[PDB]
Design a protein around this ligand. Structure first.
Ligand SMILES: CN(C)CCOc1ccc([C@H]2C[C@]3(C)[C@@H](O)CC[C@H]3[C@@H]3CCc4cc(O)ccc4[C@@H]32)cc1
Ligand SMILES: CN(C)CCOc1ccc([C@H]2C[C@]3(C)[C@@H](O)CC[C@H]3[C@@H]3CCc4cc(O)ccc4[C@@H]32)cc1
Ligand SMILES: [Mg+2]
Lengths: 231, 234
């Protein structure tokens, strides 16, 4: 029942904080810093996911499935968003801005992919309001095709998810109309934004490939995610 | 310069044929071998199709190879999902190779992917995806999949990226026009456009999982090389 303006207000209000890397800056490695940062960001991501309109209407199992599918894409879109005003570098945290040379485990290709994404956001002059919409779309869409369930409940859950996704589409279009874009510019920009999400999916897949290769007891389990969502 | 109708006409005409699996149907019924040979032959036709997608051959041959390298398995997959739409619970790899979920388990690499593909065809059916929309989506995959990974900012590459995005914009216009022709409201148009493009993220995911398996095989030419793709495009 939320208006487009109310949807934007809700998403802006739900935004998680920007966290810091944990290292003492007076002291003279990187994977441990990034892993600890991501570990702390995931806790705040669960809080954010619960404030995305329609997300807590789903079952806890479906909430876990969506977050299990989307968490690294959500970390990556956040990283790209905070790196937009840092050409050629990635702002993992305010105290951890790395260039491509510093990027050289698992980042041989991904670093450049992330840089290219932030470059594209810059080319498009992506707005904060648009960004939070995109991030919510990732949460709701990434796992919606892989519930592996044809129960009556699951059919209803998928319908709900797509209704909420439709509302966010309406909201994105509304933001563009507010800005004075023509109808043609509106549907072109909508398409351009959603097509970037495929690239973010690609980057997450490559990132998840590395995390699994580590064989470190480093990918959040279903049961960990379930514990956090119901806490 | 193409109009929306002309863009659709062009894409419909560029459509590759549906190929058959190569096995003797009188012999006892090898699945990965059959599927690989099928895909090998499909890829040859895919290159012909790609060259007929408006705007594609305007690109440098290097950039054409890069786009196809990025997109080819996605394109095979959306093709598969399209020709499986009217076969719930099954995948029509070829007209003489219709596999169900149980048979899917006989296929290495498909423990999760088979169900993912089925879910996509189910979603296409629920949306009543039209042929005109399908060819638009397939062209979008070709142009979009590799456009952020050129790893070049030569003046030429800047121009190539702009061109690609202008063509992508035209296909967006074309999709919206098809929906308007069908009498959808403006709200329904932008909702459906979004629904269609969001499925492309799932298709990328499936391709990445498929590519993971192909690389795991450590089989020469089971992933087409850059030079193989270049030889076919040229
Ligand atoms: C969350 N806990 C439960 C599990 C730890 O997950 C992690 C641990 C480390 C990262 C780092 C390290 C990588 C995966 C590299 O290898 C290849 C891509 C890297 C990503 C990039 C995205 C990203 C964004 C962030 O803002 C913080 C960390 C990271 C990552 C990302 C997620
Ligand atoms: C093209 N030549 C140069 C290289 C061979 O590429 C191949 C070889 C075999 C396939 C098969 C086997 C798989 C990858 C499984 O493993 C996991 C996903 C499978 C995909 C599914 C998509 C697909 C669609 C087709 O219409 C024909 C084959 C296939 C594939 C797909 C592509
Ligand atoms: Mg704008």
């Amino acid at each position: 029942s939320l208006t487009a303006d109310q949807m934007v207000s809700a998403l802006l209000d739900a935004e998680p904080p920007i966290l810091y890397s944990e290292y003492d800056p007076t002291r003279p490695s990187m994977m441990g810093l990034l892993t600890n940062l991501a570990d702390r960001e995931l806790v705040h991501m669960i809080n954010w996911a619960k404030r995305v309109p329609g997300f807590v209407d789903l079952t806890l199992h479906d909430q876990v499935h969506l977050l299990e599918s989307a968490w690294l894409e959500i970390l990556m879109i956040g990283l790209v968003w905070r790196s937009m005003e840092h050409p050629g570098k990635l702002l993992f945290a305010p105290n951890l801005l790395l260039d491509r040379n510093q990027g050289k485990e698992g980042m041989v290709e991904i670093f450049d992919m992330l840089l290219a994404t932030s470059s594209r956001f810059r080319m498009m002059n992506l707005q904060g309001e648009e960004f939070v919409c995109l991030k919510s779309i990732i949460l709701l869409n990434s796992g919606v095709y892989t519930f592996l369930s044809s129960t009556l409940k699951s059919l209803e859950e998928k319908d709900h998810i797509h209704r909420v996704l439709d509302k966010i589409t309406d909201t994105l279009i509304h933001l563009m109309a507010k800005a004075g874009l023509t109808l043609q510019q509106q549907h072109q920009r909508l398409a351009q934004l959603l097509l970037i999400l495929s690239h973010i999916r690609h980057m997450s897949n490559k990132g998840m490939e590395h995390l699994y290769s580590m064989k470190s007891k480093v990918v959040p389990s279903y049961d960990l995610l379930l514990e956090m969502l119901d806490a």
